[PDB]
Structure 1
Amino acid sequence: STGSATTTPIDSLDDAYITPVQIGTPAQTLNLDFDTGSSDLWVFSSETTASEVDGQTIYTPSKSTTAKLLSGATWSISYGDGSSSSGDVYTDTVSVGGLTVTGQAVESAKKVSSSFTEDSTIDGLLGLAFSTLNTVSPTQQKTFFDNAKASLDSPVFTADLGYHAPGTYNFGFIDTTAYTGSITYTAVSTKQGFWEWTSTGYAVGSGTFKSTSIDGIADTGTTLLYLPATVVSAYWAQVSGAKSSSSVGGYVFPCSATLPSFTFGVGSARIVIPGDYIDFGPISTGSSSCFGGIQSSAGIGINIFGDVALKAAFVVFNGATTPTLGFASK
């Protein structure tokens, strides 16, 4: 089997991407944030505290003939941005782009943090990291990908995120028309439950490439590119007037600037992030100070190749017995 679904930016900045997901019988379609940095499929639901729902589409398990309460199971998650959610669990039929899993754990939110409530466009998350990170207790549950894997033509999914435009998540096949050149594959460590890999270096604009190992995670659920302070300082040093602002919470730059590109290494290959991808617009409405798309990972504890980086590439998440990651230009 295979599946193919379009993923769409939630706003003009590509702050996140939503992908329609069919849950239950008859189908209830929710727009979920596919997140390769977590492993829970959770949704706004009929059980979510009413004051914490503001415009989202909810899953109502009582209206699904295939929903079954997973007796005794609860979940609770906290994300790197400080947001969180928790609730109980059903199993139900879940389909993504024509690919169907029966018996998928669908984690129903009873509580969500303000960040989630305030974002009307995201009806939940669909985790695509390794199932060892799944938070369901007392019986840990598998991700949608893990459940689908054995049925897929090939045990892979791909992320092809657009810049200010829709893109695609495919399951079970590699669309050879979706990228240019060849895909370069690189080793993955699953020890922390993430798609963790080591970039071979970076360049700023037309500058020379610096060969240096940068361990980080491929995370579709993080907006920006978070890298070591040395790397980030070298980037922003090439932008006149750019500075790190403690009050704002990262590097800002004059909105009048033209940003240089940023290149990262994948083995001997190179992925180029155009400068425009690094512009996240005014810090507040009407400001001439703009927020940078490359930020320091210091104090996160891990480097994160988020959407800013991933959207410059066609990315293969290879869930073979020994997982790997592939990157191609596009």
Structure 2
Amino acid sequence: GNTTSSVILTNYMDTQYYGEIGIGTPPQTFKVVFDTGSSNVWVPSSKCSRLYTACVYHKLFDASDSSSYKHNGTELTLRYSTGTVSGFLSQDIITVGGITVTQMFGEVTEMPALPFMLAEFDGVVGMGFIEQAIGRVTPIFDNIISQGVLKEDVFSFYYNRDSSLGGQIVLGGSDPQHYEGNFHYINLIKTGVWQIQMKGVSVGSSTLLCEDGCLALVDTGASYISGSTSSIEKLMEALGAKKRLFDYVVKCNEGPTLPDISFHLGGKEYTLTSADYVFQESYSSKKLCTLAIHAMDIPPPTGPTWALGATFIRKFYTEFDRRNNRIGFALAR
């Protein structure tokens, strides 16, 4: 086809990048994260109890207000770290940029207060494959591909630093105004997951990690770069960082002196300087500065794996190519 559709993202604090979609007739709008690490569309249901903090603070989809809704009712569940997210399947018309698609999505009726009540967005549009869809529900980008409207069966992410355009997703191509040079591509290890081979992770110009190869999930829905607890332990030792309960930290004054961390993907070292991975909220020796790298043990079959989230994407404009089952990175502007 002939279309590319872009959707403007708002950057909240360098951790949440979301844009709007519309569901139903007339459209009920929702701020959503576009998440290559997941495969389902989810918004909160109007059937969600107001005793869920995550529901009270978010917009709720109301099927009783949409003329185009088609009931399903199939229960679906995501076993999230802090508790179950669950709800039920519904079908409605969803608009993303200029694209309109009839889509099955989960209406969430219960989920943990944490981290969901902290989300500035209402929902999540999974950009991953049917292979990983809960209930094997056809994902949105599959439905869009089927419509034959896109210039190319790709979508791209631009995540800005904070903070001004917060970010941009492009459906059907990329946006040259937001990268420089050309893409370099890496083949997916397999179709079904936006996961590539990584050959190594270096601190400074020496390769401390992943020396015998490892996996890299490219996960637009993740705020941070993540590695297994054991990998991150070693990285943070190499960096001199201290473990807090939920993050790692350095004295703010040594932030700018932290080494380059390099990820070796395809034929390129993708290098983050300390400016890329330290939340430099002060330069004081009296304060602790958080690192935009965290431990996360992603269970099989996806994990164990590294995850390259917003931290990585802010630096490298990313194209996810369904036609060619590959991910392309270019230096973000």
Q: TM-score range by the shorter chain?
A: 0.7 to 0.9
Quickly say closer, same or farther: Cα 1:78–1:60, change in 2 above 3 A: same
User: How far is 1:305 from its partner?
Assistant: 1.2
Quickly say closer, same or farther: Cα 1:252–1:299, change in 2 above 3 A: farther
1:319 to 313, 322, 325: 322
Match of 1:147 in 2: 143
Say yes or no: does 1:253 pair with 2:250: yes
Quickly say closer, same or farther: Cα 1:117–1:160, change in 2 above 3 A: closer
User: How far is 1:327 from its partner?
Assistant: 0.8
Match of 1:16 in 2: 16
> Tell me, what secondary structure is at the counterpart of 1:183?
strand
Give the whole-Å Cα distance in 1 for the aligned partners of 2:276 and 2:189. 28
Greater displacement, 195-204 / 29-38: 195-204
Match of 2:40 in 1: 40
User: How far is 1:214 from its partner?
Assistant: 2.9
CA contact (8 A) 1:238 1:260 kept: no
CA contact (8 A) 1:157 1:317 kept: yes
In the alignment, residue 154 of structure 1 is paired with which amino acid?
E
User: How far is 1:181 from its partner?
Assistant: 1.5
Give the whole-Å Cα distance in 2 for the aligned partners of 1:324 and 1:6. 24
- Match runs of 1:276-295 below 5 Å: 276-280=275-279, 288-295=287-294
> Tell me, what secondary structure is at the counterpart of 2:92?
strand
> Tell me, what secondary structure is at the counterpart of 1:257?
helix
Give the whole-Å Cα distance in 1 for the aligned partners of 2:119 and 2:227. 30
Give the whole-Å Cα distance in 2 for the aligned partners of 1:253 and 1:313. 25
Could you list the per-position Cα deviations for residues 48-96 of structure 1 after superposition, in whole angstroms to 9, with x for gaps in the alignment?
11111232111111111111112x42211123x4353111121111111
User: How far is 1:326 from its partner?
Assistant: 0.8
> Tell me, what secondary structure is at the counterpart of 1:256?
helix
Give the whole-Å Cα distance in 1 for the aligned partners of 2:184 and 2:94. 32
Match of 2:176 in 1: 176
User: How far is 1:120 from its partner?
Assistant: 5.3
State percent identity of aligned pairs.
Answer: 24
In the alignment, residue 173 of structure 2 is paired with which amino acid?
F
> Tell me, what secondary structure is at the counterpart of 2:275?
helix
Give the whole-Å Cα distance in 1 for the aligned partners of 2:118 and 2:242. 29
User: How far is 1:129 from its partner?
Assistant: 1.2
Could you list the per-position Cα deviations for residues 230-258 of structure 1 after superposition, in whole angstroms to 9, with x for gaps in the alignment?
75456434545x2234xx14432223322
In the alignment, residue 156 of structure 2 is paired with which amino acid?
T
User: How far is 1:265 from its partner?
Assistant: 2.0
- Match runs of 1:1-330 below 5 Å: 1-10=3-12, 12=13, 14-52=14-52, 53-70=55-72, 72-79=73-80, 81-101=81-101, 103-119=102-118, 121-136=120-135, 140-150=136-146, 151=148, 152-165=150-163, 166-190=166-190, 193-205=192-204, 207-208=205-206, 213-227=213-227, 232=232, 235-237=235-237, 239-240=239-240, 242-245=241-244, 248-258=245-255, 259-280=258-279, 288-297=287-296, 301-320=304-323, 322-330=324-332
**How many matched pairs?**
312
> Tell me, what secondary structure is at the counterpart of 1:114?
coil
Structure having the higher helix fraction is 2
Quickly say closer, same or farther: Cα 1:78–1:289, change in 2 above 3 A: same
Quickly say closer, same or farther: Cα 1:177–1:290, change in 2 above 3 A: closer
TM-score by length of 2: 0.85
CA contact (8 A) 1:2 1:99 kept: no
TM-score by length of 1: 0.85
In the alignment, residue 78 of structure 1 is paired with which amino acid?
R
CA contact (8 A) 1:239 1:257 kept: no
CA contact (8 A) 2:189 2:197 kept: no
